[PDB]
Paper text:
We report three cryo-EM structures of SAA1.1-derived amyloid fibrils: one that was extracted from the diseased murine tissue and two that were formed from murine SAA1.1 protein in vitro. In vitro and ex vivo fibrils possess parallel cross-β sheets but differ in their overall topologies and fibril protein folds.
Cryo-EM reconstructions achieved spatial resolutions of 2.73 Å for morphology i and 2.95 Å for morphology ii. Morphology ii is also polar but presents C2 symmetry. They differ in their relative position in the fibril structure and at the interface between the two PFs. Glu8 (stack b) in one PF is opposite to Lys29 (stack a) in the other PF.
Author numbering:
A (entry chain G), B (entry chain C), C (entry chain K), D (entry chain O), E (entry chain S), F (entry chain W), ...: 1 to 37
């Protein structure tokens, strides 16, 4: 694919552009995410 | 595919452009997400 | 694929451009993520 | 793939451009991530 | 792959461009990461 | 692969360009990472 | 999507299940094809 | 979508289940085809 | 996606399940093909 | 994706499951193909 | 992805499961192919 | 990814599971191929 | 075309006879402007 | 075209006769401007 | 084209007759400007 | 083209007749500018 | 093209008739500029 | 092209008629500039 | 400007994509052009 | 400018992509052009 | 400028991509061009 | 400038990519060009 | 400038990539060019 | 400048990559060029 971004990308808490691929018999767990201002 | 973005992208809490692909016998769990201002 | 970014990329807490690939019988756990201002 | 970045990339706490690949019978655990200002 | 970066890359606490590859019967644990200002 | 970087790369605490490869029956543990200003 | 083929595929001169994808500024040619019996 | 084919496919000169997808500024040619018996 | 083929594939002159993907400024040619019996 | 082939693949002159991927400023040629019986 | 082949692959003149990947400013040629019986 | 082959591979003249990868300013040639029986 | 200006041009904060032309996939920003006397 | 200017051009903070032309995949920024007397 | 300027150009803080031309995959920044009298 | 300037050019802080041309994968920065009298 | 300048050019802090041309994978910076009288 | 300058060029701190040309994988920096009278 | 052409361009006798630019006190003469079939 | 061509360009007799630029007190003469078939 | 060509360029008699530039008090003469088939 | 060509370039009689530059009080003469088939 | 060519370049009679530069009081003469087949 | 060529370059009769530079009061004459097949 093709991806183009021009400007600002803001993320307080989390993941950006994560790529999990080609897994067999795989397991995982992600936790919570908080944003306070 | 083709993706073009011009400007600002704001995310308080979460994931952006996540790609999970090509999985067999796979399991996972994502937690909650809070936004306070 | 093709990836192009021009500008600013801000992440308070988390992962950016993570790539997990080609796993068999794999397991892991990610923790929480907090953002305070 | 092809990756091009022009500008600023800020991460308070976390990982950037992590690549885990070609694992068999593998396990790990990542901790939490805090951001205070 | 091809990787090009032009500008500034700031990480308070964490890992950048980590590459774990070609593991069999492998285990590890990463700790937490704090960012205070 | 090909890697090109032009500019500044700042890391307060952590690892940069770590490469762990070709391991069998291997184990390790990484500690926490703090950033104070 | 889902694709199931059960039987026989016969081709004297040609290509089969050709997939060209995700191209930008591309150009090509394919010549003539002759079947004589 | 869903595609099921059960039987026989015979082609003297040509292409089969060709898929061209996700093109930008592209151009090509395919010559003549002759079937003689 | 999912692809299942059960049977026989016969090709006198040609290519099979060719995949060209993720190209930028590319160009090529393929000559003629002759089948004589 | 997922690909399953069960049976026979016969090719007098050609290529099989060719994969060209992730090219930038590329160019090539493939000559003619002759099948005589 | 996942690829399974069970059976027979016969090729008089050609290449098999060729993979060309991650090229920049590249160029090549492949000659003719003849099958006579 | 995952690749499984179970059976027979026959090639009179050619290459098998050739992998060319991670090239910059490259160029080559491959001559003709003849199969006579 | 033809453009004639005879006199005085006064600008406290801003741009003058700015010409942006012939752009494709472009993006920019201009901040605030303050005039105090 | 034809452009004639006869007189005075005064600018406290800004740019003059700026020409940006013939751009593809471009992005930039210009900050604030302050005029105090 | 034709450009004629006859007189005075005064600029406290800024750029003059700046020409940016013929750019592909480009990105830049210009800071603030202050005029105090 | 044709450019004629007859008179005076005064600039406290900035650049003059800057020409950036024929760039591919480029990136830069210019700081702030201060004029005090 | 043709460029004629007749008069005076005054610059407290900056660059003059700077020409950057024919760059590929380039990156630079220019600091702040101060004019005090 | 043709360039004619007749008069006076005054620069407190900076560069004059700088020409950077024909660069590939290049990077540099220029510090601040101060003018005090 | 931007120019894109995809297909065939045939000219028996003449010029294609001629560019004469930035001339002062210039003279020339072009001859006739014949096309016979 | 930007120029892209994909396909065939045939010229029997003449010039293609000629560029005459930045001339002062210049003269020349081009002859005739014939095309016979 | 930017120039990209993908395909075939045929010229029987003439010049291709000629560049005459930056001449003062210059003269020349080009002859005729014939094409016979 | 930037020039990219991928394919075949045929010229029976003439010049290709000629560059005459930076001449003062210069003269020359080019002869005819014939193409017979 | 930048020049890239990938493929075949055929010239029966003539010059390719000629560069005449930085001449004062210079003269020369080129002869005819014939192509017969 | 930068020059890259990948493939075949054929010239029957003539000069390739000729560079005449930095001449004062210079004269010469080149003869004809014939190509017969």
């Amino acid at each position: 694919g093709f991806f183009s971004f021009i400007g600002e990308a803001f993320q307080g808490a989390g993941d950006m552009w994560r790529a999990y691929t080609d897994m067999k018999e795989a397991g995982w767990k992600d936790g919570d995410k908080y944003f306070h201002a």
